[PDB]
């Protein structure tokens, strides 16, 4: 739940996000900044150095997948649980990703937005996206709860 000014800011800035190098930059930085997340992607090959991760095609392609889900959820703001239900049980039941890593990826995404948009990603715009990423992270952790 958020104000229409937040709804406008979150959608206007997401319209500038292309196509996507942001998805790969976020998944990449999660594997770099928090290396324990690499275990879930052991079949992606080399992830030994930050460059190996950023230059990984399997990471880049999977990056496109994760950011695509965010875009889907950004339309279905009012119902985040039903939208991410088909993905919550995946990560929960047998993939076994600790729900803290959901909040880490959300925050890393927010860092990528600040990196790519700069001064455009103003503090009230960050605040709006925070409510969104907390939402997505909670929606992807409903199956554990």
């Amino acid at each position: 739940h958020l104000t229409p000014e937040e709804k406008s800011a979150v959608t206007a800035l997401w319209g500038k996000v292309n196509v996507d190098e942001v998805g790969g930059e976020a998944l990449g930085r999660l594997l770099v900044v928090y290396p324990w997340t690499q275990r879930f992607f052991e079949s992606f090959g080399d992830l030994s150095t930050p460059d190996a991760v950023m230059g990984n095609p399997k990471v880049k392609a999977h990056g496109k997948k994760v950011l695509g889900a965010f875009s889907d959820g950004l339309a279905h703001l009012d119902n985040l649980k039903g939208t991410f239900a088909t993905l919550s049980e995946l990560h929960c039941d047998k993939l076994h990703v600790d729900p803290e890593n959901f909040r880490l990826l959300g925050n890393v995404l927010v860092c990528v937005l600040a990196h790519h948009f700069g001064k455009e990603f103003t503090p009230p715009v960050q605040a709006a996206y925070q409510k969104v990423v907390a939402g997505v992270a909670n929606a992807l952790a409903h199956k554990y709860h």
């Binding site: 770099v32 927010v110 860092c111 600040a114 990196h115 700069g118 503090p123 605040a127 925070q130």
Partner: protein, 140 residues
């Protein structure tokens, strides 16, 4: 903390310059707007946009970090005075440090794009974390 993480932080904060006081102020500004619960720790303060109290406290926060980068191996002894403030008197929930550490990372990425590389970012998140753990080190 790694030797490579030590140079990565030293290079990135060496490029913040005297505008560190503004980056700290921005980070605070961000934390208050993004996580309004963190405002309980500041009743004596005015947290509106462009406030002198936020700019002054931002300077206090950033200078403490400049003191931390210089004493990368001497952190529990150099930031001892502040560990007494944050852990003994303020008793700030360690979660709040995670929120400010995040907001600072956002500020750095926004103002310094060429510097904010996945390798630099990782070293800073590690740096801020070991700074955070010192300021919340001894509680009894």
């Amino acid at each position: 903390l790694s030797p490579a993480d030590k140079t990565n932080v030293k290079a990135a904060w060496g490029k913040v310059g005297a505008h560190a006081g503004e980056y700290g102020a921005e980070a605070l500004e961000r934390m208050f707007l993004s996580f309004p619960t963190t405002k309980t720790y500041f009743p004596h303060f005015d947290l509106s946009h462009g406030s002198a109290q936020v700019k002054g406290h931002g300077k206090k926060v950033a200078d403490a970090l400049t003191n931390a980068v210089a004493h990368v191996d001497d952190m529990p002894n150099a930031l001892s005075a502040l560990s007494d403030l944050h852990a003994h008197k303020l008793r700030v929930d360690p979660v709040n440090f995670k929120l400010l550490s995040h907001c600072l990372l956002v500020t750095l990425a926004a103002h310094l794009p060429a510097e904010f590389t996945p390798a630099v970012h990782a070293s800073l998140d590690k740096f801020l974390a070991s700074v955070s753990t010192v300021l919340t080190s001894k509680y009894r």
